Amino acid sequence: SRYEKWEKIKQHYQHWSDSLSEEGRGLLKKLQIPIEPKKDDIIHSLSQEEKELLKRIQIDSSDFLSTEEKEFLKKLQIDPLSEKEKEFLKKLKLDIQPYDINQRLQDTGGLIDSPSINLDVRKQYKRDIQNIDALLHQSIGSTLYNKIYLYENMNINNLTATLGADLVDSTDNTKINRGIFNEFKKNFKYSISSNYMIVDINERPALDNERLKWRIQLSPDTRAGYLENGKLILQRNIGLEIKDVQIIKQSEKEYIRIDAKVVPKSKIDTKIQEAQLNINQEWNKALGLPKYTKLITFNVHNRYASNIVESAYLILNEWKNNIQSDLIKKVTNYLVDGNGRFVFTDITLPNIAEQYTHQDEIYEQVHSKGLYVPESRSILLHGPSKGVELRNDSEGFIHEFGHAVDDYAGYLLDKNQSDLVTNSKKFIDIFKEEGSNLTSYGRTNEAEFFAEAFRLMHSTDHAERLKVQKNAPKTFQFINDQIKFIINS
Ligand SMILES: Cc1cc(S(=O)(=O)N(Cc2cccc(N)c2)[C@H](C)C(=O)NO)ccc1F
Numbered sequence: 001s002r003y004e005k006w007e008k009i010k011q012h013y014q015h016w017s018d019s020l021s022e023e024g025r026g027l028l029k030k031l032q033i034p035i036e037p038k039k040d041d042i043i044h045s046l047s048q049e050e051k052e053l054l055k056r057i058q059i060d061s062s063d064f065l066s067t068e069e070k071e072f073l074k075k076l077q078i079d080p081l082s083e084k085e086k087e088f089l090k091k092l093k094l095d096i097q098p099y100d101i102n103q104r105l106q107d108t109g110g111l112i113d114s115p116s117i118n119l120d121v122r123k124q125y126k127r128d129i130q131n132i133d134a135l136l137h138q139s140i141g142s143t144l145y146n147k148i149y150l151y152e153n154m155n156i157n158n159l160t161a162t163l164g165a166d167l168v169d170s171t172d173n174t175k176i177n178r179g180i181f182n183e184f185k186k187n188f189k190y191s192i193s194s195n196y197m198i199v200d201i202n203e204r205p206a207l208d209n210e211r212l213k214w215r216i217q218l219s220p221d222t223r224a225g226y227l228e229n230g231k232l233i234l235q236r237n238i239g240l241e242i243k244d245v246q247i248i249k250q251s252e253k254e255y256i257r258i259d260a261k262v263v264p265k266s267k268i269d270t271k272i273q274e275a276q277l278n279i280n281q282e283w284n285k286a287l288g289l290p291k292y293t294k295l296i297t298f299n300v301h302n303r304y305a306s307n308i309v310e311s312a313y314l315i316l317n318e319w320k321n322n323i324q325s326d327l328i329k330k331v332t333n334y335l336v337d338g339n340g341r342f343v344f345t346d347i348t349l350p351n352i353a354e355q356y357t358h359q360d361e362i363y364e365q366v367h368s369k370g371l372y373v374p375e376s377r378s379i380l381l382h383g384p385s386k387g388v389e390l391r392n393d394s395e396g397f398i399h400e401f402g403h404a405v406d407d408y409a410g411y412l413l414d415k416n417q418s419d420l421v422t423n424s425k426k427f428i429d430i431f432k433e434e435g436s437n438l439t440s441y442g443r444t445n446e447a448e449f450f451a452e453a454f455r456l457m458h459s460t461d462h463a464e465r466l467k468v469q470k471n472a473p474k475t476f477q478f479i480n481d482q483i484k485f486i487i488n489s
């Protein structure tokens with residue numbers, strides 16, 4: 001019933017559609033099609049000293065910028081890297097972001113009061129989101145929820161950028177990597193929508209690397225609204241249980257079918273909160289910690305929810321396997337002493353309180369794979385993203401732990417000043433000598449060099465550990481000496 005199904009859903013919402021004020025209609029158009037910044041407005045605002053710098057900058061080169069950002073900055077220039085130009089780019093990237101309601105909701109996971117954007121824009125988002133919420137008052141009904149499926153095509157990179165890089169067979173792009181497919185689906189049991197899903201009443205062909213084809217069954221009380229050309233907008237904050245994930249073929253090309261069922265969001269948050277208790281009990285006992293120490297935090301709000309939860313077990317297992325238990329215990333106890341956390345999340349790190357409470361300047365806020373914040377003594381690990389030159393999340397976690405080791409070691413040396421051990425005169429000299437002998441990112445500064453060397457020294461690939469010894473022998477010696485010192489103290 002291709003056209004029949006469309007007509008009757010449209011009929012169901014016909015009064016709702018007619019009663020929409022233009023203000024409301026503009027809100028829904030703004031939501032589907034975000035407002036891009038005007039390239040000519042941005043350029044007019046610049047001073048040519050900055051424009052001179054902006055020309056000198058190789059846009060396609062940076063690891064700081066997204067693909068979307070790169071294209072806009074490449075398109076705009078038609079009219080390593082210094083400390084000043086990065087400072088410039090930190091501020092500039094704030095002024096080139098589209099007004100994107102659904103992106104704001106996904107980035108914050110619904111926590112829209114998070115101080116990760118300017119107060120005026122934050123309030124504008126808050127207002128539009130509350131107004132959209134009020135528009136979506138009419139549920140789909142018990143007549144329709146059962147007769148209908150709704151469809152959504154998705155890029156795998158929105159769920160996991162790490163697995164997304166390898167999902168499609170490189171030899172033959174008509175095929176899905178079976179091994180990668182398995183990793184993707186293995187722990188995919190539930191999903192959370194914190195923004196407004198825009199779904200198709202009838203399934204569409206998959207365009208532009210959208211290999212994920214969702215088939216979604218609505219709940220009777222699922223609030224929605226009809227959109228032009230056979231689409232529906234769904235309420236935010238709904239839950240989805242994954243019923244089946246299969247490789248399917250459409251037009252001689254392999255895609256992934258994801259069958260999901262709408263459930264209440266409260267139902268899934270319960271699972272996440274129980275899992276948080278389960279993983280803390282496992283690791284409090286394993287770490288010799290008080291029974292009710294809350295060290296591990298799940299900050300989960302988006303569409304790859306269950307995987308963030310499940311991967312946290314695997315990440316911490318790898319962490320335990322590759323690092324001396326005594327080191328792990330001493331450093332973690334130091335973090336617990338400062339109310340630190342292991343935060344596993346699928347919202348952007350600027351929206352994590354462990355960072356933003358200590359970083360008020362938005363241009364100084366960081367989003368990335370992982371982060372260590374000394375002020376809160378916390379490790380933050382962002383699931384959906386792909387770290388630069390990282391294989392996986394585990395290697396990413398160990399690098400951050402290296403920062404914590406750097407932190408704790410500096411504290412032990414001077415309990416009054418509590419600086420990083422990488423700020424010591426001794427290590428700065430070592431960085432000056434061996435700074436360029438390891439990873440490209442390790443060249444950045446003393447802290448990064450230490451964390452990168454630490455990560456490589458505890459890699460599952462023992463060829464990597466021996467490489468540090470051979471290429472950066474003094475760094476290797478220094479870190480091993482820091483580890484001894486931490487453990488013996
Ligand atoms: C290599 C590596 C990188 C990263 S990262 O998340 O991409 N990362 C580095 C990075 C480099 C370039 C662009 C971004 N936006 C982030 C952050 C800032 C970091 O150094 N955390 O301590 C984490 C762990 C790692 F091992």
Ligand SMILES: [Zn+2]
Nearest residue numbers: 403447448451
């Ligand atoms: Zn780092």
